[PDB]
Design a protein around this ligand. Structure first.
Ligand SMILES: [Mg+2]
Lengths: 144, 49, 171, 48, 77, 1118, 192, 48, 43
């Protein structure tokens, strides 16, 4: 068992799913621009579309790993890790929350293997810091 | 191999000799790569001037 | 009067308070006019007193600090939580002294009854009360000089290179 | 004693003083505070 | 060998629970240590050890060995 | 500069703007404060360049603010002007050696004018020694080097807020006017639609009463504030009328008890709000109020005005009504909306200059109060400016600020990066800020206005998370304290070369593109669907016509320390944060080595940090030695530079500078002449390159541990020099002074062997725990000895000397040679404090090699403690006999979501081996030929910018074209995995293993400083428990949770002994020690002292605590 | 009642009541939890060669923790004549002192603890053995019980003295008798 | 109100306490060693 | 039970797999067991 960037295999079918749901997103954006839907309708439709895309990519990823992959062997045996983290590493990171607790209707369509752009990294820092602060306070609350 | 030194105007490793470009703690690293062979079972001594 | 008699935790009489106030006033005036901190010699000459007196007057006016002043950013301790108690019984020293006492009693036992008794009653080991030579002679019914003779003999006996090493370490 | 050592020390003490409450030292915290064997585990008189 | 000897399961066959075994072994160890300390001086009621020992063995280990072998009895007072 | 070491870069984007002077944030502020010639050039260089409007230096502004000073009658006046500075009396080196405070004298031209006969008494007044700031943005206070960090505060102004009550299900509005140095006023509309005018948080009045007091009649209010029913309802529910009646009502409500009067109320209100002496919102406050409400009142002076009050009331009532836009005074129109208190449009930055100005102003307030009081009380015609001005308060305030202030911090000097990051730090807590425990979860968030102004990655991981941050690389501080960022202007879809500095509000106004936007190369966007940021910070796709700004470059949002992590975009935010926070703890090793695969930000950081010696004027090096470099400049003058050698930093490390030039070389200005503590040829180098293999190895690297090779100990790869200083002073006592000498009363002569003539250890001597460094004797006077001691003395005849020893000895567990001895005598003119005859300092230095227990870590948040150091022979070695220097567990990579380290390792191997890809007509090979990265000699360093690094395609392709080794084979297969051999068994490992070169740092968490044990030692004073800490011996605390665990096991005797005969049983500690030493039974515990102290305190509170026995009889506890 | 009095620095004075209340009063800081003697602390490393009931103490910490016992033992073996010479010999750090320490340390359990102590398996008794270094060695299996990682964590060592304390630490708190978890009954001392 | 009052009125009715203990004529003084006046090195005194 | 609780109602001791002894401090064990997982419960 070893880790090399060639072991982290992103599914080969991610491109097609992402492209199709990007076409759907563009269609909804055009519909909103003309004026046949309000803002909340666009937000909810995009959130649903990208949740579906994330689930499809996760399923393809799960079906793609060979049974002898070092990372799949680490996760399957129960030694360490779980499936959400391996989805984030090789797949689609998904939807993230805003500075205020509310989903941003524009997902991070790139995994940590393919590298995030500047805006995606900035968006992820929000949840990162919120989780860190919650971890900081949980200790005192549980102690009391 | 070499096992110890002593310089004319030096008391410890953490100092410098007037006139040389290296600290006394870099001369030590430079003479650690000094490959020598010896035949005497006693601690022979050689001189650099 | 009341301020001089009630403004300090460690009270200072009125005259010494006056001296301290005058010294502070002179020092402040010298700092203002000259623009530099006055050295002790300048104050001594201006105030017409020895430099040691100026130093003592400076040391008298200091006010105490508190043991409850916080020192850490978090605030988990006070200034009085790291003051080592320099007048407690260190258990190692106490046990060492007890062992020394036991060893001394054991060594003094090897001597004769008379010599050990005179040493004990001369250094007051049993009661802690030193006694004069004449009283020791009275109890022993001998001359004072004779008693002095016995003490020297035992003192040299213990300080010999045959019985000293049992007591050298404890010194 | 236990209530005072928990929290609201001033209120607990000013109430106990007026009520003249007497502590019998039957818990764990009281024995821990005063420095004797807790009435649990090996500190029970059945085992000692 | 070491601190896992004798096994706890075998020891617990001689008492009721761990809590009583602790006091049983501790009292026996104190008796053995007192016997060693005052062995030279005048004789006292203390006895033991009842088993083969080592050069400088912890009295608690000897007490546990004696308890396991079945050379002691605990009453109630 | 052009004289930088080679580093082949993988960047594909051309940056149009260079990073600014990273130290400007402090130097520029202090230059403004002083009024230096540099600030004069900057302000004169404001010819349509920069926001350098303020023409007044800080001290000039303060003096002009405090002038003129007049008495209650105006008979005479006093004024200050034309502040001047004299050269400093001591250099930095002298100040640090002798523990001075590097500063300069300050003179003020003060003139006293008497209105009778027209007198003028202009003269010079000395206003104390003003501390100066070095060229590195640091102060030298009392010999120690300090840093003043900026502060993030809430800018003064008017803020409108709304809240919703879950119970009443109605919205409640509020409006505050928060000044600087003033009294607040807050209006609020509650569920009852009543316009409360809460004043100075004093209960709750009605705005109608205040309006009537201000001089408004009911008819005017009705005809003006009529369209909105809330204020009509407030008016009807008044039951009062008349200006005098309302004014007296207000005074009675807010100042009850005193005899009400009309004049008292008016004067009180004017003093509260309209008096500039006790209320002054600064230029920022006036600017913000004008911007929000539209009033174009001049910024020359700011004091609350009635017009502002009515404007605020109008704004609040319109906002509550439901309006969205409004007509504003002296403006076209304004938008009605609530304010976000976290937006950097509302949060400003108080830099060093502003803080020092505030302290100087506070001192000058008392100074002028004293001046006016003494001017009034004393006589006239015999008074001159020199005898009126008392400068004690000013210097006292300056000293108070520079010492015992939360913003004047003891500098961090682990390495150049730590020092540079200590500056450029924005702290949101401190005097006038907020508190650690009161900050909520909304002020610690990453607000979308932090982009390009504050880093979102670098923050402390403790309970300070979010309250301390770092300024972004391109960030700049406005004239009013706000933070600006640069953007390239794009017009008609064409990206021009005009850079505009934009603040948070202007950023909200526009739509900003993204840094890496593919272009047709004719300065025009390509894809027609560009991801851009919009008003609310939301990202959206837009066409290339709406865009009007673009980012200057990628990595515009990441701080200086976060821009040195290669492959940052492949790392989770948490791991990047940890790596950034953990790169500041690496220690400087004896031999430095720049990273093999780094970013482009090492040279700039190392040179701008100020720890690298740089040539001042071009010339040719004349003479060179490890202690100095003398260069003959071109203009005929010669200059000699000195280098620090084995100095000591604040943190105990060693500062040592190498020389990188030769005798015959030629140097241009800005060229690097000497390295720094942790630099190699000019660029930052915090660690070493080690050959790493990813695999579990017999469990020695289990659960984050690390296995090392013995080579790293043989060649001092991870060895560092550490220095400590020990200080002892001979002072005066009641029974005479103390003396320093080698005539110690009773010490075997062998100890006094390395001591010199005056009883101070010799330079070059090696010391071990218990050795004597300085020999000191303290008199003790008459004492009575115990009978046994006297008898023993009589035996051995050793007369007592009456003076005991207090010599200085090395603490327990310390070793090393003696580097330096510095001795100060009070009788040699040294400025020792009162009652300190002599002082002496001894420096001990030792070289530490890496050993198990020492903590190592990388740049991607991967840390661990060395748990094994194997011989070279039994290490997994490549097919050509090359052992690996470090073994890391792979199980930690995936679950932690930082694949960046694997990529760094692959690229490090590629850089180490070198490659040659020139004739390849391959897609990925073409991108390499357009940037000049075709042929790379083995061992060359490479650069992958933060967000524009090397794509995986290029790495995969290059891995197949490396230079074959001496045997004509490539050891690493195209999948990145090599084929290793087992060091011990000798058989090859079943499958290929991933190997490469990783950059490893040596953190400052060495096990030498962590170990500490105790059997017995010092004890506390009031309660007799052990003395916690490590400067003492100190016992480990046994808290509540441990007590609960022991109770849960059911172990009562262990707990009882842990609580009685180990901490508090005063008479039991000695008894147990004696029992152990004599080999017998441990005695029974007693009663702890803390219980007795508690009972004594309770009895002192007039409580009748008593302990009862079986029968109702007290015990009395002795 | 009213405004508190203040001394230098304008900080409120401490009264009799303030000494009994709060997280830093007599009741909570000095009575329920105290500092103890015969205790040490250090960073933990991993030793996979140990058994489930063994721990590795650095010889400096072991020597400083067992000082009275080693002094008495080396007085017994005539390596010294009296406790004074024995104490000096131990302090100066001779060679035979460690040979004696290796045998006075046998069959003497030590309590290992890691703060925070969330449950009773956070304190466990191990049999010590000397190791060459400045870091403690912890069996890999007990980590889960301690929630202890090897990225800079530290642990504390306490020394039972009396026969009752030793019997408790040996029979009740031993490391190899605590496989199961009190919360639900599932093993925690398991390969992870 | 009467129920609340009776709780404090009843306590003194039966127990050995008396209301007069709520007003002090003499004030106790804690032993000096619990409010130490320690002399730091250099002559500075620290109080409690 | 007149005094406290009794072993048979408490049942087996999950930490040892046998009937709970007659001196066990079940209250502190319950408190610790309930409170330990507090940090895992994401707020
Ligand atoms: Mg850890």
């Amino acid at each position: 068992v070893t880790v090399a960037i060639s072991d982290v295999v992103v599914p080969e079918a991610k491109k097609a799913i992402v492209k199709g749901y990007e076409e759907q997103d563009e269609k909804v954006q055009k519909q909103y621009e003309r004026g046949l839907i309000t803002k909340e309708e666009r937000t909810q439709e995009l959130i649903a579309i990208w949740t579906k895309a994330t689930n499809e990519v996760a399923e393809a990823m799960n079906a793609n790993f060979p049974k002898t992959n070092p990372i799949f062997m680490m996760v399957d045996s129960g030694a360490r890790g779980n499936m959400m983290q391996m989805r984030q590493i090789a797949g689609m990171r998904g939807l993230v929350s805003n500075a205020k607790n509310e989903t941003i209707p524009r997902p991070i369509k790139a995994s940590f293997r393919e590298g995030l752009t500047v805006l995606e990294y900035f968006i992820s820092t929000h949840g990162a810091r919120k989780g860190l602060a919650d971890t900081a306070l949980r200790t005192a609350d549980s102690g009391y | 191999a070499v096992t110890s030194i002593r310089i004319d105007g030096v008391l410890h490793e953490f100092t410098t000799v007037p006139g040389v470009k290296e600290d006394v703690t870099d001369l030590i690293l430079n003479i650690k790569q000094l490959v020598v062979s010896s035949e005497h079972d006693e601690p022979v001594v050689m001189y650099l001037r | 009067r009341a301020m001089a008699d009630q403004a300090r935790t460690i009270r200072i009489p009125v005259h010494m308070v006056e001296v301290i106030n005058k010294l502070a006033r002179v020092q402040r005036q010298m700092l203002q006019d000259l623009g530099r901190e006055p050295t002790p010699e300048e104050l001594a000459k201006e105030l017409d007193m020895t430099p040691e007196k100026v130093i003592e007057v400076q040391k008298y006016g200091r006010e105490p600090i508190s043991l409850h002043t916080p020192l850490g950013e978090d605030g988990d301790s006070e200034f009085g939580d790291l003051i080592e108690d320099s007048e407690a019984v260190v258990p190692a020293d106490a046990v060492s002294f007890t062992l020394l006492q036991e060893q001394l009693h054991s060594v003094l036992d090897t001597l004769s009854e008379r010599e050990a008794g005179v040493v004990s009653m001369r250094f007051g080991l049993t009661d802690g009360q030193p006694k004069t030579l004449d009283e020791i002679g009275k109890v022993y019914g001998v001359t004072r000089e004779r008693i002095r003779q016995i003490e020297s003999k035992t003192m040299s006996k213990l300080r010999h290179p045959s019985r000293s090493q049992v007591l050298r370490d404890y010194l | 004693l236990s209530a005072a050592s928990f929290q609201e020390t001033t209120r607990v003490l000013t109430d106990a003083a007026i009520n003249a409450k007497s502590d019998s030292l039957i818990g764990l915290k009281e024995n821990v505070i005063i420095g004797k064997l807790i009435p649990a585990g090996t500190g029970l008189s059945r085992y000692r | 060998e070491g601190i896992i000897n004798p096994p706890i399961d075998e020891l617990l066959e001689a008492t009721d629970s761990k809590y009583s075994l602790v006091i049983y072994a501790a009292k026996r160890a104190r008796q053995i240590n007192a016997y060693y300390s005052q062995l030279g001086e005048g004789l006292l009621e203390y006895v033991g050890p009842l088993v083969d020992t080592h050069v400088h063995e912890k009295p608690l280990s000897i007490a546990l060995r004696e308890i396991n072998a079945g050379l002691l009895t605990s009453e109630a007072i | 500069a052009s004289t930088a070491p080679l580093r082949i870069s993988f960047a594909k984007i051309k940056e149009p703007l260079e990073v600014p002077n990273l130290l400007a944030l402090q130097t520029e502020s202090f230059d403004w404060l002083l009024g230096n010639a540099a600030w004069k050039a900057r302000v004169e260089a404001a010819l349509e360049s920069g926001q350098d409007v303020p023409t007044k230096s800080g001290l000039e502004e303060i003096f002009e603010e405090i002038s003129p000073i007049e008495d209650f009658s105006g008979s005479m006046s006093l004024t200050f002007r034309d502040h001047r500075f004299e050269p400093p009396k001591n250099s930095i080196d002298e100040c640090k050696d002798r523990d001075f405070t590097y500063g300069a004298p300050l003179f003020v031209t003060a003139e006293f004018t008497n209105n009778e006969t027209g007198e003028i008494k202009s003269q010079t007044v000395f206003m104390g020694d003003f501390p100066l700031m070095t060229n590195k943005g640091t102060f030298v206070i009392n010999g120690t080097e300090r840093v003043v960090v900026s502060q993030l505060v809430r800018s003064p102004g008017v803020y409108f807020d709304s809240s919703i009550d879950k119970t009443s299900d109605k919205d409640i509005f509020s409006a505050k006017i928060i000044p600087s140095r003033g009294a607040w006023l807050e209006m609020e509309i509650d569920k009852r639609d009543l316009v409360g005018v809460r004043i100075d948080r004093k209960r709750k009045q009605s705005v109608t009463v205040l309006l009537k007091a201000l001089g408004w009649t009911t008819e005017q209010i009705l005809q003006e504030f009529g369209e909105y029913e809330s204020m009509r309802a407030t008016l009807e529910k008044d039951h009062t009328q008349g200006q005098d009646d309302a004014l007296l009502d207000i005074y009675r409500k807010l100042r009850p008890g005193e005899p009400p009067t009309r004049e008292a109320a008016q004067t009180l209100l004017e003093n509260l709000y309209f008096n500039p002496k006790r209320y002054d919102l600064a230029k920022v406050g006036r600017y913000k109020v004008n911007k929000k409400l539209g009033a174009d009142e001049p910024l020359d002076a700011g004091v609350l005005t009635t017009d502002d009050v009515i404007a605020t009331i109008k704004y609040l009532v319109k906002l509550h009504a439901g309006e969205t836009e409004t007509i504003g005074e002296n403006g076209n129109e304004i938008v009605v909306e609530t304010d976000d208190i976290d937006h950097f449009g509302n949060r400003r930055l108080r830099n060093v200059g502003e803080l020092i100005q505030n302290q100087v102003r506070t001192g000058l307030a008392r100074m002028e109060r004293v001046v006016r009081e003494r001017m009034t009380t004393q006589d006239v015609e015999a008074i001159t400016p020199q005898t009126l001005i008392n400068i004690r308060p000013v210097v006292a305030s300056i000293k108070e600020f520079f010492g015992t202030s939360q913003l004047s911090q003891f500098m961090d000097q682990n390495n150049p990066l730590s020092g540079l990051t200590h500056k450029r730090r924005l702290s949101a807590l401190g005097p006038g800020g907020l508190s650690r425990e009161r900050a909520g979860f909304e002020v610690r968030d990453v607000h979308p206005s932090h982009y390009g102004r504050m880093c979102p990655i670098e923050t402390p991981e403790g309970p300070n998370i979010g309250l301390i941050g770092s300024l972004a690389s391109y960030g700049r501080v406005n004239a009013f304290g706000f933070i600006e960022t640069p953007y390239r202007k794009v017009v008609d879809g064409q990206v021009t070369d005009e850079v505009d500095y934009v603040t948070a509000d202007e950023e909200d106004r526009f739509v900003i593109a993204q840094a890496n936007a593919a272009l047709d190369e004719e300065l025009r966007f390509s894809e027609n669907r560009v991801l851009v940021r919009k008003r609310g910070g939301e990202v959206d796709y837009v066409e290339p016509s709406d865009v009007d700004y673009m980012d200057v470059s990628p990595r515009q949002m990441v701080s200086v320390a976060t821009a040195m992590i290669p492959f940052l975009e492949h790392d989770d935010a948490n791991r990047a944060l940890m790596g950034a926070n953990m790169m500041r703890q690496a220690v400087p090793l004896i031999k430095s080595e720049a990273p093999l695969v780094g970013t482009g930000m090492e040279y700039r950081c190392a040179t701008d940090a100020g720890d690298v010696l740089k040539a001042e004027k071009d010339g040719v090096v004349q003479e060179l030695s490890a202690d100095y470099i003398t260069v003959a400049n071109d203009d005929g003058t010669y200059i000699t530079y000195r280098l620090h050698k084995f100095s000591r930093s604040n943190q105990g490390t060693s500062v040592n500078q190498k020389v990188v030039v030769d005798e015959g070389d030629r140097v241009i200005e800005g060229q690097v002449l000497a390295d720094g503590p942790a630099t190699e040829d000019g660029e930052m180098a915090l660690g070493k390159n080690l050959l790493v293999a990813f695999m579990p190895w017999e469990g020695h690297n289990y659960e984050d541990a690390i296995i090392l090779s013995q080579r790293l100990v043989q060649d001092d790869v991870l060895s560092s020099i550490h220095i400590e200083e020990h200080e002892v002073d001979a002072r005066d006592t009641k029974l005479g002074p103390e003396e320093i000498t080698r005539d110690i009363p009773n010490v075997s002569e062998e100890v006094l062997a390395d001591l010199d003539e005056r009883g101070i250890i010799r330079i070059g001597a090696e010391v071990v725990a218990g050795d004597i460094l300085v020999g000191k004797v303290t008199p003790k006077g008459e004492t009575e000895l115990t009978p046994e001691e006297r008898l023993l003395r009589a035996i051995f005849g050793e007369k007592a000397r009456e003076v005991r020893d207090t010599s200085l000895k090395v603490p327990h567990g310390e070793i090393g040679k003696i580097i330096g001895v510095r001795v100060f005598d009070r009788e040699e003119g040294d400025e020792l404090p009162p009652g300190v005859n002599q002082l002496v300092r001894v420096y001990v230095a030792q070289k530490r090699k890496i050993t198990d227990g020492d903590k190592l870590a990388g740049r991607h948040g991967n840390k661990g403690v060395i748990s094994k150091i194997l011989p070279i022979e039994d290490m997994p070695f490549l097919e050509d006999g090359t052992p690996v220097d470090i073994i890391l567990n792979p199980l930690g990579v995936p679950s932690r979501m930082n694949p960046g380290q694997v990529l760094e390792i692959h690229l490090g191997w590629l850089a180490s081996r070198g490659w040659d890809v020139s004739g390849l007509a391959d897609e990925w090979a073409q991108r390499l030929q357009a940037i000049g990265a075709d042929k790379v000699a083995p061992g060359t360093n490479v650069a992958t910018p933060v967000f524009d690094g090397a794509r995986e395609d290029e790495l995969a392709g290059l891995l197949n074209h490396t230079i074959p080794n001496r045997d004509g084979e490539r050891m690493v297969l195209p999948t990145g995995k090599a084929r290793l051999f087992d060091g011990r068994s000798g058989e090859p490992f079943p499958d290929p293993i991933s190997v490469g070169y990783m950059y490893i740092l040596k953190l400052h968490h060495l096990v030498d400083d962590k170990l500490h044990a105790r059997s017995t030692g010092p004890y506390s004073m009031i309660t007799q428990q052990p003395l916690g800490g490590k400067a003492q011996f100190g016992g480990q605390r046994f808290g509540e949770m441990e007590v609960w665990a022991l109770e849960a096991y059911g172990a009562a005797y262990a707990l009882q002994e842990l609580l009685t005969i180990k901490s508090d049983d005063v008479t039991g500690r000695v008894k147990v020690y004696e029992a152990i030493v004599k080999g017998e039974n441990i005695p029974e515990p007693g009663i702890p002292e803390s219980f007795k102290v508690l009972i004594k305190e309770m009895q002192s509170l007039c409580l009748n605590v008593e302990v009862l026995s079986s029968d109702g009889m007290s015990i009395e506890m002795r | 009642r009213g405004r508190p009095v203040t001394g230098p620095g304008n900080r409120p004075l401490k009264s009799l009541s303030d000494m009994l209340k709060g997280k830093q009063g007599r009741f909570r800081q000095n009575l329920l939890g105290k500092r103890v003697d015969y205790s040490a602390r250090s960073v933990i490393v991993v030793g996979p060669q140990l058994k489930l009931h063994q721990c590795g103490l650095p010889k400096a910490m072991a020597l400083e923790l067992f000082k009275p016992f080693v002094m008495k033992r080396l007085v017994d073996l005539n390596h010294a004549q009296n406790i004074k010479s024995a104490k000096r010999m131990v302090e100066r750090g001779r060679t035979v002192v460690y040979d004696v320490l290796e045998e006075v340390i046998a069959e003497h359990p030590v309590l290992l603890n890691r703060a925070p102590t969330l449950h009773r398996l956070g304190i466990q008794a191990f049999e010590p053995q000397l190791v060459e270094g400045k870091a403690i060695q912890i069996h890999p299996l007990v980590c889960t019980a301690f929630n202890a990682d090897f990225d800079g964590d530290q642990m504390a060592v306490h020394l039972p003295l009396s026969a009752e304390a030793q019997a408790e630490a040996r029979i009740l708190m031993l490391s190899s008798n605590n496989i199961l978890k009190p919360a639900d009954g599932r093993p925690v001392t398991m390969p992870t | 109100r009467a129920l609340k009052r009776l709780k404090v009125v009843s306590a003194f009715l039966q127990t050995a306490n008396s209301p007069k203990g709520m007003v002090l004529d003499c004030v106790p003084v804690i032993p000096p060693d619990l409010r130490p006046m320690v002399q730091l090195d250099g002559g500075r005194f620290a109080t409690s | 039970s007149a005094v406290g609780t009794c072993a048979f109602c408490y049942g087996r001791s999950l930490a040892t797999g046998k009937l709970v002894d007659i001196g066990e401090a079940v209250g502190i064990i319950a408190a610790q067991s309930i409170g330990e997982p507090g940090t895992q419960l994401t707020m």
